[PDB]
Amino acid sequence: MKASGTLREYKVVGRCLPTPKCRTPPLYRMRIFAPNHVVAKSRFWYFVSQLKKMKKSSGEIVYCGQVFEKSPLRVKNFGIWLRYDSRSGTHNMYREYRDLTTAGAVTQCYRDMGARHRARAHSIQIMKVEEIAASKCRRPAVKQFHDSKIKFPLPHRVLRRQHKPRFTTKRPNTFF
Amino acid sequence: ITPGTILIILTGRHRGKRVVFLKQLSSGLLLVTGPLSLNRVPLRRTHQKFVIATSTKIDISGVKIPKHLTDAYFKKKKKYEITEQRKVDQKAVDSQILPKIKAVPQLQGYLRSVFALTNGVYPHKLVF
Amino acid sequence: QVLVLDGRGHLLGRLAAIVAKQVLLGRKVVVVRCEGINISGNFYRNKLKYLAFLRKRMNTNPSRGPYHFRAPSRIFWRTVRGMLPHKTKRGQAALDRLKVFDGIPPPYDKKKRMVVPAALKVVRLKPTRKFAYLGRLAHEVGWKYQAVTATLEEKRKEKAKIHYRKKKQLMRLRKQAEKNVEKKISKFTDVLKTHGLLV
Amino acid sequence: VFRRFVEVGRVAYVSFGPHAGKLVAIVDVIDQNRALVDGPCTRVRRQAMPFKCMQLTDFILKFPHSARQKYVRKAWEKADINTKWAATRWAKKIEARERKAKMTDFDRYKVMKAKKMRNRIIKNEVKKLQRAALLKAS
Amino acid sequence: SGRLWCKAIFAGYKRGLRNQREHTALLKIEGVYARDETEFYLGKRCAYVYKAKNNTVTPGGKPNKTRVIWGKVTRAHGNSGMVRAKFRSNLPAKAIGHRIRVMLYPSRI
Amino acid sequence: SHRKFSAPRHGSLGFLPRKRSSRHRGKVKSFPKDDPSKPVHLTAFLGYKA
RNA sequence: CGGAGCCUCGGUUGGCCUCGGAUAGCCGGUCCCCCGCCGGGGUCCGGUGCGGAGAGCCCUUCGUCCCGGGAAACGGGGCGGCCGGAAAGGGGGCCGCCCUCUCGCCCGUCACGCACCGCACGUUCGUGGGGAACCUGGCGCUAAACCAUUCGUAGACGACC
RNA sequence: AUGAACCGAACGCCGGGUUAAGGCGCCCGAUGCCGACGCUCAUCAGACCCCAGAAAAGGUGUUGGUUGAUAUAGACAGCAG
Ligand SMILES: [Mg+2]
Ligand SMILES: [Mg+2]
Ligand SMILES: [Mg+2]
Ligand SMILES: [Mg+2]
Ligand SMILES: [Mg+2]
Predict the structure, then answer these.
(1) Which positions bear N6-succinyllysine (chain E)?
(2) Nucleotide G21: nearest residue by CA–C1'?
C-alpha cells in the first residue's frame, strides 16, 4: 500500500464462509485507512489473516463503507499508536497530531513518519486512533497550540510566484 | 457579431481600421462599411473569420439599407472604375450612419484612428 | 531590447541558468556588478572548491590546461558557458550574445538594472544560511582589481546619488504642479479614475 | 517590530486558492502552517486554510476561538467590516486594477487621448515652474 | 499603421532528448507563459519572414527579396506557454532563436 | 617504479619559456610603489655596459 | 564636409536617460531641531501586499480642408557663445538671434484624398554595414615598409641589433 | 550520460493522438505548479536495481520514540553552611 493523497477511513466487516461445523461464524469489524476501498479490503484481509485463522478464500467481506468525520469543523488533537519496522527491529510509537479529521490526522501521520524515520506505508501498520483532549496531550509540539489567547505574526514571507515578474526592476519585500 | 457593432479589419488593404458592421450577406460574408469621410471605407464585403469584433455597438435597428445590393452587386467584374450608383448608395447609407455614430462622444475619432500593437500589448490579456 | 541584470544579491548558478536560457532564446543580456554575486554555502567551502578547480590542470602542458579566470565577470561567464552547448555554432553564438562586465561601465551605468527574483538570495535562501560574495572570493583567489573597482563604484554611486536628488525634486515639482492644476485637469483625471488608472 | 499578528478574530485577504479575493476571519489555528477560517458575510464556508494563501490585514473582531458561524456573522456585521474594507486604500487599488483589466478597446482609446492632454498640461506647468525657480535663484 | 502580429521566438523543433521531428516546431509567444493563456493563440497563422539574394514575386505589390514560410498553430506544449506549430515546409535550423510573426486574422473572438 | 636515488630537478621552471626576447632593451616590469610623502624623483635610468 | 543609382549581407517591426540598500523592515515629505562641504542625523506626518506600483511610465502615425470651444501666449522649427563626459568619454543642458505661428495638442461643423470592387510577406531602427566608378564644389597631404648592402651585442635558414 | 545481457518495448514507408520505463533549473523536449508535509550544515555533504565504491565503533550536532525515576512535603542546577 502507498498513501497516495489524503487517506479515507473505512469501516469493514468480514466473516468466514458458513460451514457444516458452525453455521454462523463471528463477524469482525476493523477501522482502516486507505486511498480507496479496493486496497482497503486488501488491508483488512491482511490484518485479519495476521490476527485470526481467516483467509481471503476461507472468508468473505460483508460491508466495506466509508466513515465520515462526525465533526470536521472542530480542530481536534489525535493520539496515534503505531507499530512499524525500522532498518533492524520493529518499534511501537505514540505520536500526537492536530487536525480537523481523523483521516487527515492519519494521512499527516503517514507523511511525517516517512519523513522522519523513512518508514514507508507498507512497513507502517496502524493499530488505534482516537481523539485526545488537550489536558491528556503529552507532546509539547501539540500542547503549545493549546492557548485561548494565541497570537503570533508571520516573520518572513518568502516571495512566492517568482517567475511571473521574472524580469523586473523591483527588489521584493518580505515584510508585511 | 451583431448588426451595429464595430469591427477591426486585419487582412485587406484597409487593415487595422475600425469599421461599422451592417448585416450578414447571402454569401456568408459580412457587409461592412465605415464612414468614408472618417476612415475611407466604402460599402465592402469582408470575411467573418478575418475580422476582430469588439465590445462597442450602436443601435442601427432604425436604419434601412438598400435592398438592391447583394453578392452579385459586390462581385468583381473584370483599371477599376467607380460607378455613380456606388457613390449614391454610399452617401445614402452615410447620411443614416454618421449622425447616429456622432451621438456617442469621441466615436468619430476612434473610428478614424487605427489599431496597432505596441510593446507589452498582448491580445490574450487585453479584452476588446 | 537588451536586458541589464544587476549581479548584486543573485545566486551564481540560479542566475546563470535563467541567463543562459534567455540568451538561447535570442535575447541580448548583460550582467553588471558581478562582484556582488552571492554563492550559497560558507565562504571556506566555496573557496576550497575553487582551489580544487585551480589544482585541476593539464600535467604535460599547463598552457593547454583549463583556463582558470580570476575575475568575477569571467567566472560568471564560464559558469554560464557550462550550461550551453558551446561546442556548437548556436552555443558560440549565444556566448557572443552574452556580455559580462565587472562593475558598472559607463555604457550601462546610465540605464536601469533589472533584478530576477527567481535567483535572488533573499528569496531562494533561508536567512540562517551562510553565503559568499563572488567579488571577495575572486580577490582571495587572485583578482587584482577589487580596490580600483570599489573606488569606481563609490564614485558612480555618489554621482547617481546626485542624479537621484534631481529626480526627486523633479517629482516633487510635478506633484505640486498637479495639485495646482487639478482644477483645469479634473475632466482629464476622473476618466482615468473611472477606468482604474489614477486610484 | 510587527503590527499584524495572526490571532483569533483577525480578517485576512486571500490572494490565491479557491476563494481568492474574499476576506475571511480566522477562528482557530490548527498547526504551524494551517488555521481554521470562515467568512460568514462573504459566502465562504468554515474550512482549513494555510497561512501562505491568506494575507492578514489590520482588522480584528472579538469572538472566542470556538464560536460558531452564527456569532461570527454577528461580529462581522456589527463591526461593519465590508464597508471598512470598501473604504480602505487597499481595496480601492485592487478595484482599480480590476477596472483597468476590464478596460475595453474604445475606452482605452478615450483614456489614451485624455492622458495625452493631461501629460501635456502637467509638463508645461512643471517647466513654467522650473523657469520661475531659476529666476528666483538668480 | 503599425504591427498587427504577435511576437514569437522559434525555440526549437518537437524533439526528444536524442531525437527530433522536424515537421513540428516549438514557438514561445511573448507575453503568454501558461496553458490557460495559450488557448487564444490556437489555430492562428504563424509566418517566418526572411530575406534572400534575388528578387521574388510579392502579392499586391512590387517584387522584392522577402520570402516567408506559412504555418498554423496546432496546440499547446507544456505548462510554460510554449506552443506547437506546423508549417508548409519544415523551418530551417537557422531560425533558432529568431522572430516569428503570429497573425490575428484567424480570429475566434 | 620510483626513482632509486632522489635528486634535485635540473633547471628552473620559473624561466620556462627560454626563448629569444622580443624586445632588445630590457624593459621594467614594475616600478617601486609610489608614496606621496617622498619628493618627486625618477625611479629608473638607462646605461650601456662597458 | 557638402546629390541620384547597382551588387552582396542579414535580422529587426516604439522607447523607458541610472540612487544606494534592508528583507525580524522599508518608502516619501517635513522642519518646530542639531551639526557639516545643499548633505547627514533627531522630531512630526502620510503609505506598506509596495501606487512616487516594471501588475509600472512616456509617444502614439491616417492626412488635409473651413469655421467654433478648452490649454499655450513665457512655446514649436532653425544661427552664435557658456559648461557638464575618462572604467570602454555626453549628438545633453543653459543664454541671446533677423526669420515663423496661433498649424502643431483635447473636444465640436464641413467635405475630399484610386472607395484599386473580402484574400500573403503590409507598417520601421533605413541617409543600415561592405564594394566599383559614375560625381559636382571647398578646406589640408606629398609617406613609409620590404628586398638588396653593411653591421655582429645576434644567428642552422629565417629572425634580431 | 557512457554500455552485447539491466527497465519498457521488439521493427514494412508515413500523418494525427496517447502512453510504458525514465524524466520536467540549463545543456535537454517537459513543473515558468503562487505544489503539500518534515529532516538535513557537511573545513570529504547528498543526489535513483544491476552500478561502479565502504565496515565494526563512537557523537552533549540535531529530531522522533520507548522505559525507569523526582518535584510545591518545594527538586536538576548554581552560589554558601
Ligand atoms: Mg625518492
Ligand atoms: Mg521590411
Ligand atoms: Mg521485471
Ligand atoms: Mg508518432
Ligand atoms: Mg534527461
Answers:
(1) 62
(2) A171
Q: Give the bases of strand G that a protein CB approaches within 7 Å.
A: 7-26, 28-30, 38-39, 47-63, 70-75, 85-89, 94-95, 105-123, 154-155, 159-161
Interhelix angle C89-97/C72-81, nearest 10 degrees: 150
Question: CA geometry: angle at B110 spanning B104 and B111, to 5°?
Answer: 95
* Ligand lying closest to the C-alpha of residue F1: 1
Query: d(Cα E35, Cα E82) in Å, to the nearest integer?
Result: 8
Closest CA to B29 of B48, B16, B43: B48
Query: In angstroms, rounded to a whole number, what is the distance separating the alpha carbons of residues D28 and D61?
Result: 13
- Residue A123, C-beta contacts closer than 8 angstroms, at least 6 positions apart: A84, A85
Residue C165 CA, nucleotide G83 C1', distance (Å): 20
Q: Give the determination technique.
A: cryo-EM
Residue A168, C-beta contacts closer than 8 angstroms, at least 6 positions apart: C114, C115, C116, C117
From the list C47, C54, C32, the residue with the least C-alpha distance to C133 is C47
Gap between the Cα atoms of A66 and A6, Å rounded: 13
Is B50 touching E (CB cutoff 8 A)?
yes
One-letter amino acid at B75 equals K
> How many residue contacts between A and C have a Cβ separation below 8 Å?
35
Q: Is the CB of B100 under 7 A from strand G?
A: no
Q: Which residues partner with F18 through β-bridges? A: none
Closest CA to C28 of C97, C111, C113: C97
* Closest residue in chain D to residue C188, using alpha carbons only: D114
Is the CB of D101 within 7 Å of strand G?
A: no
φ, ψ dihedrals at A2, nearest 5°: -125, 135
CA–CA gap between residue C3 and residue C22 (Å, rounded): 10
Beta-strand ranges (E) seen in chain F are none
Asked if residue B125 lies in contact with residue B117, where contact means CB atoms within 8 angstroms, the answer is no
Provide the 3-class DSSP secondary structure of residue D79.
helix
Cα B45 from Cα B30, distance rounded (Å): 6
Selection from C146, C151, C20 nearest residue C76 by Cα: C20
| Dihedral, D122, D123, D125, D129 alpha carbons, nearest 10 | 130
Cα-to-chain-centroid distance, residue A25:
30
Distance E21 CA to ligand 4 centre (A): 9
Would you call D97 an interface residue with chain B, using a CB distance cutoff of 8 Å?
no
Which protein residue has its CA closest to C1' of G52? C171
Q: Which candidate, E56, E70, E59, E91, places its Cα nearest to that of E5? A: E70
| C25-58 burial code (b ≥16 CB/10 A, e <16) | bbbebbbbbbbbbbbbeeeeebbeebeeeeeeee
* Contact assessment for residue A82 and residue A108, using Cβ atoms and an 8 Å cutoff: no
Helix (H, G, I), strand (E, B) or coil at E16: coil
For B119, residues 6+ apart whose C-beta sits below 8 A from its C-beta are none
Quick one: residue E81, left, alpha or beta (phi over 0 = left, psi -120 to 50 = alpha)?
Answer: left
Find the angle CA(B121)-CA(B123)-CA(B128) to the nearest 5 degrees.
105
Residue of C187, C195, C197, C198 to mutate for D, most D C-beta atoms under 10 A: C195
Resolution (A): 3.1
CB of C163 lies under 7 Å from some atom of strand G: yes
Give the nearest nucleotide to A112, CA to C1'.
H38
Top residue of A146, A150, A175 to mutate, by most chain D CBs within 10 Å, is A150
Give the total residue count for chain D: 138
Query: D136: Cβ–Cβ under 8 A, 6 or more apart, which residues?
Result: none
Check the CA dihedral E55-E57-E63-E69 and report its sign. Answer: negative
**DSSP secondary structure of B72-115:** HHHS--------HHHHHHHHHHHHHHHHHHTTSTTHHHHHHSB-
> For chain B, first and last CA: distance in Å?
13
